[PDB]
Symmetry: D2
Subunit: 445 residues, 4 copies
């Protein structure tokens, strides 16, 4: 029984640790090719299954209506490179590492999505993944500028038709269609390249895709989104799921809930790999590790933290003085109008303590509220990973980076070898495709 490992970070200034760009070890090379090439090569040296990128299309002015926080202090999406370009860059200099990009079904037509990932899948020789998200934000809306705003759960309904359209397109070409018979002049068998002719309620695409199928057949479908409608969506489509849980109990529930949704949709639950995100901080001794973590968490500015907390909760908390205690917010707006997730974050993060908005945002900024921080030696981290795996937390772990590129160098040089020595993580790539690393079947046309 071996676990999977994945890397994850924004093509930009911040991922989960909101003080990361301030870290003494941060190169902040996120505008340069070299930065991404170093990181991709490092994770491949550590035999990672994959690396994938989140995405948002707007700087967030969202809290509360301003960039002065985001841009001035380095909040979420202050810098955000288009993710598919970035992984093409990474694909060019690796040969085994799987690579994923987050693209919303909202903003692009299925033809575009299908061709972009089929192209990347071929260029990388069958190593690509699309992380499917159904987001719609007005600012993103403001940027791409389209306002018909569809309700959260209906976006997933549309996304069902979207995925079907994309997969029809990826099946345009039989895997034996291309002939390249030079002598005879037969380029391809036109009876094995078929029109798509899709017309559903939401979308219309004609086809065929002008891009044949790679050696893994189709890109791997990644999925992120844990809403009840999102888990149903994952049951039907996800081949790997991006999850975040603060502790083993929540990890195990999410795991079993997702595997249940998959089985309920008629699919094999062992063909959907669940990853849970964890943020390790290493030290030669546990003491050093805990001091490094303390240093890391002290870089978070209370307002950048609050900004993200405002965005994730849907409540704008900039409207209040920063010293407002959380119970004066519930007092001021009534418990019915303060999101549950926000009341559950205040209770868990404060431990019963009535915290100011400053301190709540500061703590939220350390780890986005729910990504577990693990401080310890390489041996301790290896142990924790192995025991969570054995307790059924996940099929693999996403390693959320405290600072870049350095943390991945530390994790690969110190933690990966220990995992290999215990026999719970690959010593070498067995196959060449992302499907093979993940133990997924090669889909048929």
């Amino acid at each position: 029984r071996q676990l999977h490992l994945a890397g994850f970070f924004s093509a930009g200034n911040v991922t989960h640790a909101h003080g990361a760009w301030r870290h003494v070890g941060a190169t902040n090379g996120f505008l340069t090719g070299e930065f991404y090439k170093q990181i991709a090569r490092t994770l491949e040296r550590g035999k990672f299954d994959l690396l994938f990128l989140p995405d948002g299309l707007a700087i967030e002015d969202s809290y509360g209506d301003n960039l002065e926080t985001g841009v001035g202090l380095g909040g979420q999406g202050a810098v955000a490179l288009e993710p598919t370009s970035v992984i093409a860059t990474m694909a060019a200099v690796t040969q085994r590492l799987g690579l994923g990009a987050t693209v919303s079904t909202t903003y692009y037509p299925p033809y575009h999505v299908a061709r972009v990932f089929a192209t990347l899948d071929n260029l990388s020789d069958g190593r690509i993944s699309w992380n499917v998200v159904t987001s719609l934000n007005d600012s993103e809306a403001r940027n791409f500028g389209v306002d018909e705003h569809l309700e959260h759960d209906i976006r997933y309904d549309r996304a069902d038709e979207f995925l079907e359209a994309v997969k029809k397109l990826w099946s345009s070409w039989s895997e034996d269609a291309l002939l390249l018979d030079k002598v005879g002049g037969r380029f391809a068998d036109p009876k094995k390249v078929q029109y798509v002719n899709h017309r559903g309620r939401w979308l219309s695409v004609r086809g065929p895709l002008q891009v044949p199928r790679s050696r893994q057949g189709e890109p791997v479908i990644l999925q992120a989104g844990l809403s009840p409608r999102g888990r149903r969506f994952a049951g039907r489509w996800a081949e790997a799921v991006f999850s975040v849980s603060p502790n083993l109990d929540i990890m195990r529930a999410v795991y079993q809930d997702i595997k249940a949704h998959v089985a309920a949709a008629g699919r094999d639950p062992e063909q959907t790999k669940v990853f849970t995100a964890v943020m390790p901080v290493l030290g030669e001794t546990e003491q050093v590790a805990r001091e490094r973590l303390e240093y890391l968490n002290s870089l978070v500015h209370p307002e950048v933290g609050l900004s993200t907390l405002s965005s994730h909760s849907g409540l704008n908390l900039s409207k209040y003085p920063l010293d407002t205690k959380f119970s004066d917010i519930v007092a001021d707006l009534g418990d019915r109008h303060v999101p549950t997730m926000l009341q559950m974050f205040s209770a868990v993060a404060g431990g019963g303590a009535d915290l100011t908005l400053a301190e709540l945002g500061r703590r939220y900024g350390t780890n986005v509220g729910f990504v577990p921080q693990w401080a310890g030696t390489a041996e301790q981290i290896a142990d924790q990973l192995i025991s969570h795996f054995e307790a059924g937390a996940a099929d693999g772990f996403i390693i959320s980076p405290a600072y870049l590129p350095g943390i991945y160098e530390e994790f690969v040089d110190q933690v990966v070898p220990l995992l290999q020595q215990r026999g719970v993580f690959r010593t070498e790539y067995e196959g060449t495709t992302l499907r093979e690393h993940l133990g997924l079947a090669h889909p048929e046309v």
Copy 2:
């Protein structure tokens, strides 16, 4: 006074020579990263200014409305990779070569175009170019599933506002906005990052762009489109122009006309570089060159040739038997209703002879009618490039490949050194950016 050199080929089976995939030397590696990496490194080894890719978003299927000729025999766009992914791949393995991609203003929002190229421009450290095109044909639309028919000249009017929007977005970040002051916690100066708030007749985008400016400020604007409206457009926006002319008389006229449009738009004509395309075929002796050219041209299948000729002429010629002579086509449609390009191509390619459709399509397939074929020794090709340059044909030449990747290995190894010894082509890159190679000024925010 030095000339410029550019590479050009589709990320796919065919560019201008319709027998290229059948050439004994063709690797047909156009689905692999390696193919593109080899070519990009080769052109950088030869100190080329740039390489750019065309694009079409559908298998050309009009003649007449079928997969079978295009796919079966390997016509235009039978395989067509998404071009921006492809040059991202090339950028990761080069450090000087300029890289361009053709993207239509029709099918994407200005926000997308701006973010993709800003990303590539940053990933490549200031080496990227967008080749602006305004196309819109029904099959591509059928894929993007849209009902629109903006008339040709109106597409250019919309493109004016489009470019304006993209350039506003690329000016979101001043070049001194990014601070990365870790000690003070100041990421960036928010007074140097500006909202865009563009609301024009055609488009609306708010901004700012989440991507700072590269060391060359903004991507270089390439343009392709030689219609009277397109030349006006080039006058206003183009920093480099993609042109194709069958002989020196037409090259010089196109040259002077473009430079005139640029001056008429209030811009400096020497800040718009005109490239003209030529298809060289080398041999150790002139005799060897001519036999290789004859071999190359003998690979063109008459029906693939005819397919492209139909698409370009706007006339479906599948309806006729292949042995139909061209004058029964003129009889069948009336001299008035025969597109001018089609009448000029028939007269030029036949030299007055009445040709079958097979033979007309076959000759069109050799060079898309109007790309000059130059057979000779390295010294002769070098001579011809120099004399055309001295005769005011162009500021630079696009080298259309008879077959890939080999032809570029030959060109870089045999012709480039001769140009360098004569002092008309750079022996080494003087700058690091595409603007520096082309001698373009660094634009202000």
Copy 3:
């Protein structure tokens, strides 16, 4: 049953074709890393078993005790880079291709040879080869400050002990000696690293080697030397043999002779792979190919060919006039005292005739007298290779380059795919080491 392919060229101006540096396509980049990196990456792209380099440690100056000819016209070894440095350079940018260097047993101590190749073998993860040679020439000696005389056959007797010393050194480290037990503080098992204490008639070396064994155990032994003593030496030590024969029948005879020597030495003949050198000249048509061979052969200066002919035959022909007829030299030297190779060359070149030594030197300069020039289409060349292989000419072919880097780009693009489609050449590397490519066993400690 598949054939093997090897590349072979001098790290310098000339290999077998003496007009190569003058070829219009020759880059003459033999002083730069880029030149060697390109060729290695190209031969790896073509799935070649290996690439190796010859060596001489002095500008040939025997004819006529001066460098005016060698240096002035670009003769053998006019430029000659140190070969182990070069293949280290190639190893760094490849991961499958085997890489070999010729080093003479005469000029270096066994410890030095062992350490250099053990190092390269580790650096390349098991892809290195030593081409064993026993040369001793005075100019080389003059350079090394040696005033050593040892007779041809005795040099080989000495080499037997040399090989034995080197192979002991490569067994210094057991393959399980290295522990890297950090926690316990045990670097390596001291009972599995052993002193050598070699004290023989010729050499003494103590050991152990400071370099452990790579994944292929030991560097592959290549050998070049076709003399009667040379074949015995190959019989005992060679794992691969570099041979040259002018036609299939002699190829076949040398082939069986070497396999017989291997069997006579008590070894398995299928564990010594025989390569024979061939010089292909490709053309799209046979006519083009023959014109290209004619062009290439016309670049040879009669005196450079003659210079080389002198060095291989042992007679310095410089003293004679260029119009000295060949039977007038044997008249004044007797059937008894002019070398055997020298007139199996003259007759073969005339096939009957009396030529001036100018003409004899010119013809020798094209292909070093005995390397067959094969001009044809890719299909014909592929046919001939398969046909010679099936006829028992060799286990593999050394592809002698008419000019560099260009000829290898053509061969990999045109001939290799044809071999692969016929199933007689690997479509992909099955293993990672040079031993696995050659189908050699992993030697024991």
Copy 4:
């Protein structure tokens, strides 16, 4: 006025910190190409002047003529790859970084040293350096099967002629000798390529060298050897000096003495750059750094230090009891029969206390006695480098690695940017050669 930076480490298990291979972060990849490619790319990313490697031609078995200590516990030179091969590997994947290798004048002929470094200088396009050393040890002489023992100072006398011989060889080719006139058939001007025919007291070399001059003319001469005879030697030949001093006071004296010896040799002291070695240990806080230093030092086994200390003293400490008080040991020899370096070191223990032999060996294993360990934050390390530089300690610093590859990643990511912000270290390479980086003149032929 900027300081220079150099990297330095053995191609093997240990450099100065003898517990390094045991460090949790050490990859111990010293047998793989990847390990060296990574370190070299990292130092190039950090704009280092140079990286050079030490060497020994035998496993360190002196204490006590057995390998059980050296091999069993991982003392210095237990694994030691041939250094010229290693830097060739590094040169292939870098384009600016300087690269040097240590080769003894004792064991190789001048022709061999000359050709290897001329070859490397060309492969690297002028970035190479030879670190001149005059060592002669018994284990090493018995691997090369040498039995002549030359007195310490005489080896340096021999070395004087050695360098003249090597520099003569490097002037074999005029920098305008190579012509490559393909049309005229003139390879090179033979009157600009000269025989050497060097015959002095010690050595004889004929020439010419088969390798032309690189872009920087000749390899840079590094030297290491601080005996009085070594410093006179450095005065005459060295262009950069490797020095080690435990504090600013000794640094400054060593600095000024070397500059004087150079002036005394009639050379410009500004044209010989002196480097001093320091071993930094970084932490996010000073507390963290001091702890990481403690961890590092706690990995040192007392006997490996002594194994290594035996050779440096050159006294064999192997059979004195480990708890032998040092002074008591002092007595059999007589204060007069004690090598001094060891003696100051006893002094440099710094407690001036009678110390166990275990304990002297432990401390020596820590930092080779005299390389200062600096623990602190990046700012503190930068400060100390700047303040030492300004106080005239050295023209540049050698950064001795606590553990590899990681410490260089930390150093380049944390300290270099700070040095750059202060303007005391280059933000970018101004030239392409090692001579340009060090501010050395281009020597003429």
